[PDB]
């Protein structure tokens, strides 16, 4: 069975750049590819309903190609509208499969995260819950790793991360991580720290605080 | 009518749902043709032109 080898997994560019992407089928199909855009948390939008075959109502900047095994998508000078994911699809009669989508994004130089750690407010803590927040305020590119340590003990399974998409004035990513603990468990330990690694950092960055200090 | 084309009439009854469904599906294609393709009426529009 077919698997799609879409490349790259992320494309970096800017307004007015002409860009090309490529989906390569693991075994040959009869030019049964189509291409979609997807904006974050939205439904995908169909661009090209057969390889090189643009859907009506789609902006004329779009294009593509197909050879029965190797295929392309191309955009003829990106708009600020175009900085979304793009997915290839192979569609058979009663099944389909998709590429791991090419994320199109606004380019800049590498920038390391400014890291900040916030203890729980006393007002939260008296209710019985402690939410410790770690903020990576601005960085580029998107890929970063945050780990929590409580009394130098690497934590696992008690945190939730979300990343804001590219900032409108500098195109950096930002991450915040929330470590959640009942008031009981939080008052059991002293230091609460978050440790960060990223493309711009030569060594991990750790921010910490001592409970009550 | 199957006896008229020389096909033994039990070929209808043994296939009666298949034949009913192919008639119904083929009438469906007429709407798709005539709705989509204004050039299908080419003789009548030629006479009016």
């Amino acid at each position: 069975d077919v698997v799609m080898t879409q490349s790259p997994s992320t494309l970096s560019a800017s307004v007015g750049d002409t860009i090309t992407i490529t989906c390569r089928a693991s075994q040959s199909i009869e030019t049964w590819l189509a291409w979609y855009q997807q904006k974050p948390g939205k439904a995908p939008k169909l661009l090209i309903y057969k390889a090189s075959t643009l859907k009506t109502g789609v902006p004329s900047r779009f294009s593509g190609s197909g050879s029965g095994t190797e295929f392309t998508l191309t955009i003829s000078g990106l708009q600020f509208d175009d900085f979304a994911t793009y997915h290839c699809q192979h569609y058979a009669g009663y099944s389909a499969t998709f590429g791991q989508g090419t994320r199109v994004e606004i380019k800049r130089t590498v920038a390391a995260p400014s890291v900040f750690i916030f203890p729980p407010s006393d007002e939260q803590l008296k209710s019985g819950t402690a939410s410790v927040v770690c903020l990576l305020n601005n960085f580029y590119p998107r890929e970063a790793k945050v780990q929590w340590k409580v009394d130098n003990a690497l934590q696992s399974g008690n945190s939730q991360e979300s990343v804001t998409e590219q900032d409108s004035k500098d195109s950096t990513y930002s991450l915040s991580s929330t470590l959640t603990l009942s008031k009981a468990d939080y008052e059991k330990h002293k230091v609460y720290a978050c440790e960060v690694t990223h493309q711009g950092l030569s060594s991990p960055v750790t921010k910490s605080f001592n409970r009550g200090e | 009518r199957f006896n008229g084309i020389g096909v033994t009439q039990n070929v209808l009854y043994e296939n009666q749902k298949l034949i009913a469904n192919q008639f119904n599906s083929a009438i469906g294609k007429i709407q798709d043709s005539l709705s989509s393709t204004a050039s299908a009426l080419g003789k009548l529009q030629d006479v009016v032109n």
Partner: protein, 218 residues
């Protein structure tokens, strides 16, 4: 314009079960093969299931094949997806899209989609109880308060089954947290509160949790 409207998605537990549905507007599904798609937290689209025109053929992606069932209603224009014993990676946005074109054919792409509905399969399949004492302040009453356990049931005995007279173990109540709680009590002679030991044996077979709690005066 035409519309599709997914419904039923929300929080779920691993090895628990849910059913999605999709309604439509401005069109009839009776002409169309109808498909379920999802976007996992990893960001990629996965196809999930489809059901043909005339409800003839049902097909699935191999991660959900056998576990899920797709269904339809050509008259009121609804599609359904039963999700028996969900996996953690069944967590996704689940979209309902129609196979379609201006002129239909034996093979077309997905030309209209609904806004999608979120499903989250939380990984805690069973939760083991907490047990707390109901301390005795003639005849006195004491007991145990089993709490925060999922699914039912919990069994309770007292002194390993030697104390049965006067015992009431109540039906569980379902809390607004989605977790169960029940209390088991017993009345006994006040004179025995100093000498006799009272232990409630709480067994929760679904989590393989056993707790023996001794109940004594404060």
């Amino acid at each position: 314009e035409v519309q599709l409207v997914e419904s039923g998605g929300g929080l779920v537990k691993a090895g628990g079960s849910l059913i999605l549905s999709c309604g439509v507007s401005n069109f009839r599904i009776s002409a169309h093969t109808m498909n379920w798609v999802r976007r996992v937290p990893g960001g990629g689209l996965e196809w999930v299931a489809s059901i043909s025109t005339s409800s003839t053929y049902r097909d699935y992606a191999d991660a959900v094949k056998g576990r899920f069932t797709v269904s339809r209603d050509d008259l009121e224009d609804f599609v359904y997806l039963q999700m028996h014993k969900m996996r953690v990676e069944d967590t996704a946005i689940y979209y309902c899209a129609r196979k379609g074109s201006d002129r239909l054919s034996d093979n077309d792409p997905f030309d209209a989609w609904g806004p999608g509905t979120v499903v989250t399969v939380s990984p805690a399949s069973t939760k083991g109880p907490s047990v707390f004492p109901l301390a005795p302040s003639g005849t006195a009453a004491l007991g145990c308060l089993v709490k925060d356990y999922f699914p039912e049931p919990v069994t309770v005995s007292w002194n390993s089954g030697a104390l049965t007279s006067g015992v009431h173990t109540f039906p569980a109540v379902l809390q607004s947290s989605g977790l169960y709680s029940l209390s088991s009590v017993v009345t006994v002679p006040s004179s025995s509160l100093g000498t006799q030991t009272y232990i409630c044996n709480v067994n929760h077979k679904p989590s393989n949790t056993k707790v023996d709690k001794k109940v004594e005066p404060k």
